[PDB]
Amino acid sequence: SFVKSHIRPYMDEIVTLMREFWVMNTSIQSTIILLIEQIVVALGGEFKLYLPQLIPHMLRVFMHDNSPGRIVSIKLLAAIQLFGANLDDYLHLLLPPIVKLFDAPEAPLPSRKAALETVDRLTESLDFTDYASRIIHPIVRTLDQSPELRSTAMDTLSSLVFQLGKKYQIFIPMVNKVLVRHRINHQRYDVLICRIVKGYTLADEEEDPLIYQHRMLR
């Protein structure tokens, strides 16, 4: 936390120390996760060099978790929301474990909420256009068998269809069945689909989301 980016010449060995004492189910993960968060805040952009070595363990935490209420999964999810644009080349083997977390009907409800919210918040720095079919269907499955995860799943869906332009117009009749079956009203999803079906402009539809994020950051 004190040396921001000068820890690089001694960072690799640090990872070598974390891969040795990160056993699966003990009280040592609660501090390893905080160490990961602090390393992420320190490196800030160069973390992608040392992210792969910590990817297996994370996966073994997502499936082999026997914590009361799945609180280690929640801490790991809150630690993942800090990665930002670092998990750009590694979103392919780290997203499926999270999409498998909120569509499982036996997982605790707060863990599913945490997964939905981290998927919702990870779209403010990443391009989620390619991984559209892997997210649209688990969400419409979470919407018809979970009467309490409706609002958070709708927020995630609205944040996802904001990046997709007219590329989402093919899914509208598929989601509308579930939306009218349970009388699901969301005010931002209605806005987005109204601007998708009926045109708003021509330059605003089918736009790179990173371009929009950059032009709104300035």
Partner 1 sequence: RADVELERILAPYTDFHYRHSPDTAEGQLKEDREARFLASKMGIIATFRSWAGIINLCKPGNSGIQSLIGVLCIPNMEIRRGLLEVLYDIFRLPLPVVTEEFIEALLSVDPGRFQDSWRLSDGFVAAEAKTILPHRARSRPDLMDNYLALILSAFIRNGLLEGLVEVITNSDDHISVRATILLGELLHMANTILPHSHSHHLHCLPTLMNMAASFDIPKEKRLRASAALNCLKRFHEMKKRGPKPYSLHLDHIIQKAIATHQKRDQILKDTEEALLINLRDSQVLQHKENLEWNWNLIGTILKWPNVNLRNYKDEQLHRFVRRLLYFYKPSSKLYANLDLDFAKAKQLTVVGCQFTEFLLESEEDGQGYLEDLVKDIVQWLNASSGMKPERSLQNNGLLTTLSQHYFLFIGTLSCHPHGVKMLEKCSVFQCLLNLCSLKNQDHLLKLTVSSLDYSRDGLARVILSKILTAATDACRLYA
**Under rule CB under 8 A, residue 195 binds partner 1:** yes
Is 105 or 199 the residue whose CB approaches partner 1 more closely? 199
**Region 122-151 residues binding partner 1, contact defined as CB under 8 A:** none
For position 216 contacting partner 1 by CB under 8 A, the verdict is no
Beta-carbon contacts of residue 93 (< 8 Å; ≥ 6 apart): 55, 59
Using CB under 8 A, pick the residue from 13, 64, 203, 216 that binds partner 1: 203
Interface with partner 1 includes 201 (CB under 8 A)? yes
Q: Looking at residue 10, what DSSP letter applies?
A: G
State whether residue 44 is helix, strand or coil.
coil
Site for partner 1 in 171-190 (CB under 8 A): 176, 180, 185, 187, 190
Q: Which residues are CB-contacts of 160 (< 8 A; sequence separation ≥ 6)?
A: 123, 128, 132, 135, 136, 139
Distances 71 to 61, 92, 125 between C-alpha atoms, Å: 11, 24, 25
Rounded to 5°, angle at Cα 113 from 71 and 189: 165
Binding mask of the shown chain, residues 43 to 82, with x at each position contacting partner 1 by CB under 8 A: -----xx---------------------------------
23-31, 63-71, 146-154, 196-204 -> range binding partner 1 (CB under 8 A): 196-204
Q: How far is CA 145 from CA 29, 106, 158, in A?
A: 33, 12, 19
Chain positions contacting partner 1, by CB under 8 A: 48-49, 88-89, 176, 180, 185, 187, 190-191, 194-195, 197-203, 206-208, 210-211, 214-215
